Ligand binder design. Sequence first.
Ligand SMILES: Cc1cc2nc3c(=O)[nH]c(=O)nc-3n(C[C@H](O)[C@H](O)[C@H](O)COP(=O)(O)OP(=O)(O)OC[C@H]3O[C@@H](n4cnc5c(N)ncnc54)[C@H](O)[C@@H]3O)c2cc1C
Ligand SMILES: Cc1cc2nc3c(=O)[nH]c(=O)nc-3n(C[C@H](O)[C@H](O)[C@H](O)COP(=O)(O)OP(=O)(O)OC[C@H]3O[C@@H](n4cnc5c(N)ncnc54)[C@H](O)[C@@H]3O)c2cc1C
Ligand SMILES: Cc1cc2nc3c(=O)[nH]c(=O)nc-3n(C[C@H](O)[C@H](O)[C@H](O)COP(=O)(O)OP(=O)(O)OC[C@H]3O[C@@H](n4cnc5c(N)ncnc54)[C@H](O)[C@@H]3O)c2cc1C
Ligand SMILES: Cc1ncc(C[n+]2csc(CCOP(=O)(O)OP(=O)(O)O)c2C)c(N)n1
Ligand SMILES: Cc1ncc(C[n+]2csc(CCOP(=O)(O)OP(=O)(O)O)c2C)c(N)n1
Ligand SMILES: Cc1ncc(C[n+]2csc(CCOP(=O)(O)OP(=O)(O)O)c2C)c(N)n1
Ligand SMILES: O=C1CCCCC1=O
Ligand SMILES: O=C1CCCCC1=O
Ligand SMILES: O=C1CCCCC1=O
Ligand SMILES: [Mg+2]
Ligand SMILES: [Mg+2]
Ligand SMILES: [Mg+2]
Lengths: 587, 587, 587
Amino acid sequence: AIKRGADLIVEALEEYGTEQVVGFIGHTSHFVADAFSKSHLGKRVINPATELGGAWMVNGYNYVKDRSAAVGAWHCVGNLLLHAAMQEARTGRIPAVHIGLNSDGRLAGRSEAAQQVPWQSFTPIARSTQRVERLDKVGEAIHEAFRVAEGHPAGPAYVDIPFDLTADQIDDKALVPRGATRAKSVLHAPNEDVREAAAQLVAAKNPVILAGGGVARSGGSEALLKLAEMVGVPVVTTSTGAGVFPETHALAMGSAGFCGWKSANDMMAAADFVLVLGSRLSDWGIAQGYITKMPKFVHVDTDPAVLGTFYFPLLSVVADAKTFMEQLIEVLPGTSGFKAVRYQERENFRQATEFRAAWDGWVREQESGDGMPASMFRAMAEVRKVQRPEDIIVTDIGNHTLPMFGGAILQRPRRLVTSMAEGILGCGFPMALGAQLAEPNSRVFLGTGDGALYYHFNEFRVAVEHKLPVITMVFTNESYGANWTLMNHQFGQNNWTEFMNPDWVGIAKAFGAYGESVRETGDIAGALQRAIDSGKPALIEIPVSKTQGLASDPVGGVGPNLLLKGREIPVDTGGSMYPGENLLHLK
Amino acid sequence: AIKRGADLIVEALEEYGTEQVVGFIGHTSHFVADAFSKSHLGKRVINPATELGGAWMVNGYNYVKDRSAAVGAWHCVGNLLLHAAMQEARTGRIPAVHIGLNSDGRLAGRSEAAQQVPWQSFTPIARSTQRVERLDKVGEAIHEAFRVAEGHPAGPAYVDIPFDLTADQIDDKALVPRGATRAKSVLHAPNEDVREAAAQLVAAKNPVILAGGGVARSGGSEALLKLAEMVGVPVVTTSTGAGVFPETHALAMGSAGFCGWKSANDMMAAADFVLVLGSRLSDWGIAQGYITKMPKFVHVDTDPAVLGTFYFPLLSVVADAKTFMEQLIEVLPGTSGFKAVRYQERENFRQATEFRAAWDGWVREQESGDGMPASMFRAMAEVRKVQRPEDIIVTDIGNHTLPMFGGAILQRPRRLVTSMAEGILGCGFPMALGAQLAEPNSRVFLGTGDGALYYHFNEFRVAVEHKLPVITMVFTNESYGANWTLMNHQFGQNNWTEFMNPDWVGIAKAFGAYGESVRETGDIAGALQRAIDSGKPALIEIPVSKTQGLASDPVGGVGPNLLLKGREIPVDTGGSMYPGENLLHLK
Amino acid sequence: AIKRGADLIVEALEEYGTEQVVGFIGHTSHFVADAFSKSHLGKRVINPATELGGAWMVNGYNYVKDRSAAVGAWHCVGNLLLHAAMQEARTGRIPAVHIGLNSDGRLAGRSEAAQQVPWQSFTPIARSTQRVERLDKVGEAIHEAFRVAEGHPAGPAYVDIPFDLTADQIDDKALVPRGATRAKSVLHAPNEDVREAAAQLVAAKNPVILAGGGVARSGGSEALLKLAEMVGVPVVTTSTGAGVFPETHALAMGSAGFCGWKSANDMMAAADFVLVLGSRLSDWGIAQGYITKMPKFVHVDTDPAVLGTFYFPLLSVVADAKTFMEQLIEVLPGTSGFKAVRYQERENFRQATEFRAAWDGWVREQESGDGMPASMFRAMAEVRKVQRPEDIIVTDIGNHTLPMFGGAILQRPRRLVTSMAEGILGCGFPMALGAQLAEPNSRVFLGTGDGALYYHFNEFRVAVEHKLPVITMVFTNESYGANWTLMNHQFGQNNWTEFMNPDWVGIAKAFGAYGESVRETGDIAGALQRAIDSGKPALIEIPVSKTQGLASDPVGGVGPNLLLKGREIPVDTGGSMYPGENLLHLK
Ligand SMILES: Cc1cc2nc3c(=O)[nH]c(=O)nc-3n(C[C@H](O)[C@H](O)[C@H](O)COP(=O)(O)OP(=O)(O)OC[C@H]3O[C@@H](n4cnc5c(N)ncnc54)[C@H](O)[C@@H]3O)c2cc1C
Ligand SMILES: Cc1cc2nc3c(=O)[nH]c(=O)nc-3n(C[C@H](O)[C@H](O)[C@H](O)COP(=O)(O)OP(=O)(O)OC[C@H]3O[C@@H](n4cnc5c(N)ncnc54)[C@H](O)[C@@H]3O)c2cc1C
Ligand SMILES: Cc1cc2nc3c(=O)[nH]c(=O)nc-3n(C[C@H](O)[C@H](O)[C@H](O)COP(=O)(O)OP(=O)(O)OC[C@H]3O[C@@H](n4cnc5c(N)ncnc54)[C@H](O)[C@@H]3O)c2cc1C
Ligand SMILES: Cc1ncc(C[n+]2csc(CCOP(=O)(O)OP(=O)(O)O)c2C)c(N)n1
Ligand SMILES: Cc1ncc(C[n+]2csc(CCOP(=O)(O)OP(=O)(O)O)c2C)c(N)n1
Ligand SMILES: Cc1ncc(C[n+]2csc(CCOP(=O)(O)OP(=O)(O)O)c2C)c(N)n1
Ligand SMILES: O=C1CCCCC1=O
Ligand SMILES: O=C1CCCCC1=O
Ligand SMILES: O=C1CCCCC1=O
Ligand SMILES: [Mg+2]
Ligand SMILES: [Mg+2]
Ligand SMILES: [Mg+2]
């Protein structure tokens, strides 16, 4: 049957499981928009204020879904705004398919052409970059994009299609690949490796299980709870893993790292052995700038590239995290040295509970006071009083990241959202809107700095039109507070850190969102109640200090090395000159 | 003297004539910001709301200056936002040096590293992309960047410097190249070429001189006025050339092209010969999607790559525009057939004045009218009543582009600003702020769509803090009106075009800008005067139609081919299968 | 008319002035080879032993022609051999169009595909890299390739065409661009610049004119002779400029640089002013590893990118070399201080003739001597006894390069050929075959090392079949003699330098070439005469020392810095670890 390339694009997207389209209009996307209007995808298309805001929504949506359920579809030069969000998806393991409609292929390669997008700029970023030359390759290329995006490692795939192909027509027989079943990802470990890991766990004086975001992707929460209680071993997470183990449990230390919980950092410093499940041991994660000293450890991942790249394990194992834990549960009764007793009765339990109690005491101290400015730990204590197990916490990047991570106490996977891998400022608001689109009946709370909110608050258009009831706290300090604080330490003076805020309540009201400031009241509790009652996107202005959080608060970190010390470098005396030095030799 | 890398960067920027920095803080830019605070250039730093907004400011500043007088300096991941603005600077011939401070060079190449920016993503976009490996190359790299950016063709240069080199120190002897060197750009043509062009001009029955942006870069206004009057020849411009010839002159036909003046398109259709000076005959300029039929023509440019790429001239000449005109003026008295006659008495004068009169009458009709929705030609007529010769007109991309081009009547060069080469939505507001920074004796009037203003209105923080009294007219239609209109022509139905606006007056007020709506009053003249009187950046909300301008108004255009018709494409019958087709051959 | 893509390719190559094809068969080049067999150009096809050998032939042919008169046409995977020759054409300013026929476009992008050539591997090398997507772009792409290749700077252009488009057919109306267009390259300087250069030249006590390869491209020999005699100024060349000034003239100092004439290096050290015409002042040319100290200088080039990149001139001028000289000759009589005097009576004449005499005496000593091992200066003295003014001297890269440059005494341009820009071993033999194809009225003498001849002596198949009577002297030392010598200077010990030779006379005989060894006879003069008399390609085996030439002979050089001295580098003490260091902190 004769079909337009635009219709075939829509058909392929539907075949591979697309639920949500984020699209931007222009003459190159006209046929695609027309085709979507005839599909069940048409109704709920999001047309964002900008393409980078929309690309952040795709990342929030897909981070919580663990598949490319949201897709981008972009008119030519709007694809030039994608790179920042695309880079986060790469290193942050977010599946995400982007379809770029380029200008007419007849005009490609002409030196004075307009809007001929340099798709080769994505080659260093996307996990897959494809330029489609021929109409009969459109289905094929979209099939490949999903294959790469939803693999191990997950990441972004970009497909560039000159838009004349979207207008052209062809017979459709077999053109969209249909009917594939993917390989299972329940990879089992060798029995000997399971037994060696069991033997280490039972021999250790102060063991730890370290669960990263792979445990969430694997669906391993039930197995982790059973394992940790059976061996009686404290659980530490990464920031992407937080919530895979209930953080109200006596064994829960929280997340290790420089914006994490001191209980977790104390536990990692005390440990003699670690079982690492589904973590890449990253720079701004466990490695803390490659300064952290790992105890002896077993490392279990589905991606061999992460195993042994920097930290050399005692044993590296290619396996699924859930599956590995189930294998371990089966072998432990027959492991020499294993004793089946309640976790509360183990010798290692007191030290772990002490670390947690000391952390919890510090956090309670940070929640105290009723000043202006307010404490961001106090703001999070108020969120917790109105927070359900399914609800999602979002943050942006800055001093505020630390109190958001420290005040988040989670019970389910994928409830903590940000630009985890890259720390790209401005992510938080649009990622929160994407997460809300993915889970319409979950409540989404965002804690954002003022410098951060400046980026994409234009997306209040989408929030108000689509009635996305995200509750946003904007922490105001008239500064890039992390940099204010760090530069004062480093040089004795800050520069480039200060700015004027708008009347944020006035901004919210100008869009038709709920707005309220607690500057004169301190009534964070009441503001959250009123925001929730509104049924609208909401903005609550909360004044904070320039110093609280990332750049100041003692959580047991060792890195990263942000305030590096320069070295004196020798000149080159081999005889070659600098450019222009010729003039200095003239007599 | 022992100096930090950061200090050497600042010294190099000052040496090569930097006047204005647009810079964004983060730990990788800390040493550079500290260095700037100790220097003359430190007094002129804009900290923008976002890096893309700031990169658009660099483009507006440098478009009007024709050199890289503004420079960008960005913390690592913020560089990921630059690509859209950088692509405009490339094809639009805007000099622009961007300094990206990457993360620690020690951490480069590690797969789980944070904030290691893929500088190779700029290779297909910048005219020069350099990754600096060594401290003793920092001055050399910056020198090279300016040389490439300020060449023929002009464009963007990106320099990636790992930030450890900014903290490191070295003896500075000869390290920053001083005393640089620059050839004149007054390239002279051979006498043969001059004589042939003069003979063609004199022999023509209906000649035209076509003046592009190269006449502006050349400084050729005085020579062009003398040559046009001496031979008695109508003048047509490109959109970047508008204003090099006084647009109130009897011989001024205005700009050719699809958003241009119908007098210019009429004259181009009537002409038997064209002398083209400083134009690249581009897709969305004179070529109109490569549909325009050029008369026999002589083509004169400083860049040989533009000569003969698509339109084959009678004669191609490598020469400076001002210089070539001066050579022609000297040769005309001894050219066969030449006689000195007043231009008003030449046989071709009446035809040209008739074309201009017809256009002027149509413009008067488009201004004719009071009430709401307002005509954008009426808005421009009101601007002209309060416009000085050095004032600058800025537009964004959309239906509104055509009335902004058509209602701009200019008397000096470089007074008309937009994303001319690439048509990138949202350029207008930040390019206007950049232009105002560069040209503090110019009043800057921006006519922007609502869909466009949505992108970078966050930059009202810069406009208010730096007291930049740009007068912005936001034309409201609650639509991407160009696409509503094109899609209605193409399909009889629009999709992805409609959206809500905030209360734009409320937005302005929340930033401390002047705000006023004429929705109820129709009082455009009063709103302009009150906006001028305030001394502040101003936002005037003006309701308009969905359809007026680019996608509807007949100005004599022939292209581009935005609404292309699909072709039926044969399948491949070679024998090879589609992916997944194997399952269809099982029985 | 309906035409195959293959036919349209041939038509385009003929239109843009192709004279010679170097082509390699495979199924992807079948249609193109069939098309060539039906065309005028089909009569001039070389099928080389390998694609790299053939690409070197294209370089030799086009170096001497200064246009892309030879073109490559290659079956898919054979394109993978081009990169070395392509890189020489880029930095050495050799025009060269290469047409790669890729595998079926239907199969592109499949991960398990065969012979899908990564054309993106050429992007960092060619001046233009184009992948053609559509049959109706084949003529356009070829047109663009010639425009880039034959520009300023000249260089290589690569066009990748999937071979299905060569079999496909289309109506040909307007598809191959005809009537192309080309601006003159006689760029004139402004009068100010001409007058200043003349005043500097006249005021100097010890001037020099430095003439590079741009004087050859310009055709400026006649003007240079007149200018040098009129002002009475010694002439120095680059290695690509040698022969633009008659090297038997009293004012001829020869070529400066590390493999040049000591008379030229002496004169450059004595000079108070230099006028540089058509030179890029390159690393292994005049810069000598960026160590050379230039006197105050005026720098004149057609390519602004060479002016002021490293050596900062007193004055930079964009102009054609021949033209600028002609302008100078016209201005000199009215320049203050100028007087017409015979050059032999100027006060600077004696110094220059003394330099040349000292060099000539040293060369005579180096020729002094009979017996074995032979002096390579003696071999060149024997060539000169049988050398015509249009004959061509070719060399490879090694110790032997210096005596080939030093014993070549030339009277016309473009008579000295090698991999000048990149020093790529094995260039000599195939570049000599290319040069012979281009210049059938030239006798071509190649002086090659043994290590070099090893690369492409397989091309004796081409030399014999096409009756190309190149006279090759193979200098035998059973070593990479430059590296034996440099390593002995550097370490007191060589490594990886020594090897066996075949019986080279036997090799020649096995191909049907003339072969003779002088190992027993010393009879170089007789061997040259017998080789000429045969009418065949010839190989003369001449034993030589391991050490004579580049790495040993004192010619007044100061660089480059090939034998650099290491520096002690501080470690990083920031706190971060090496990969695997974790295991060292466990106790
Ligand atoms: C300002 C700032 C502060 C931060 N502070 C911290 C902090 O204090 N602590 C912290 O942890 N992070 C912090 N981060 C986040 C950090 O940068 C990383 O994003 C994070 O630590 C990576 O988590 P992960 O190692 O679990 O790997 P992820 O990035 O979540 O990747 C998942 C891993 O699991 C594997 N995997 C996937 N599926 C499976 C499966 N089925 N079975 C087995 N393996 C699987 C993958 O191959 C990969 O190795 C911070 C970031 C910012 C911007
Ligand atoms: C929505 C939209 C609508 C548009 N409508 C129109 C329209 O109607 N008409 C129109 O013209 N454009 C229009 N444009 C702009 C268009 O896309 C191009 O940006 C513009 O036409 C290019 O102008 P130009 O040819 O003068 O070259 P520029 O881009 O200005 O480049 C300068 C040229 O002059 C040469 N040059 C520089 N210095 C010298 C010198 N000293 N001497 C000689 N030569 C020199 C350069 O090498 C180059 O060729 C539109 C753009 C958009 C986005
Ligand atoms: C082992 C080895 C040893 C070598 N030894 C030496 C040595 O001793 N001395 C030496 O000189 N080189 C030597 N070379 C060669 C050297 O590396 C360079 O290839 C050479 O010096 C470059 O010559 P050039 O500066 O004349 O520029 P070219 O590479 O010849 O480039 C031509 C220049 O002229 C300009 N030009 C072109 N047309 C015109 C025109 N119409 N008008 C004006 N300008 C024009 C171009 O833009 C360019 O700047 C050696 C190479 C090797 C491999
Ligand atoms: C795109 C981008 N620009 C800049 C930065 C550097 N950066 C990281 S956190 C931060 C401060 C953010 O300020 P704000 O949102 O107000 O939070 P606070 O530090 O005040 O809590 C900055 C400037 C970045 N990571 N990404
Ligand atoms: C980044 C980007 N996204 C999208 C577009 C496509 N586009 C061009 S003009 C236009 C309409 C803009 O709407 P508005 O600013 O309201 O102007 P109007 O057409 O209503 O005058 C759009 C969507 C583009 N060129 N660049
Ligand atoms: C492809 C390549 N490989 C290696 C070299 C390094 N190289 C340059 S000169 C030289 C010696 C060549 O030996 P030969 O041809 O025998 O000349 P000789 O030095 O003995 O005169 C070598 C190995 C190079 N420049 N290019
Ligand atoms: O989508 C469009 C419509 C025409 C002008 C520009 C553009 O991007
Ligand atoms: O980009 C960042 C992130 C957190 C530390 C400070 C900074 O500038
Ligand atoms: O040219 C060919 C023919 C088929 C085998 C391989 C190849 O390259
Ligand atoms: Mg803040
Ligand atoms: Mg609009
Ligand atoms: Mg040898």
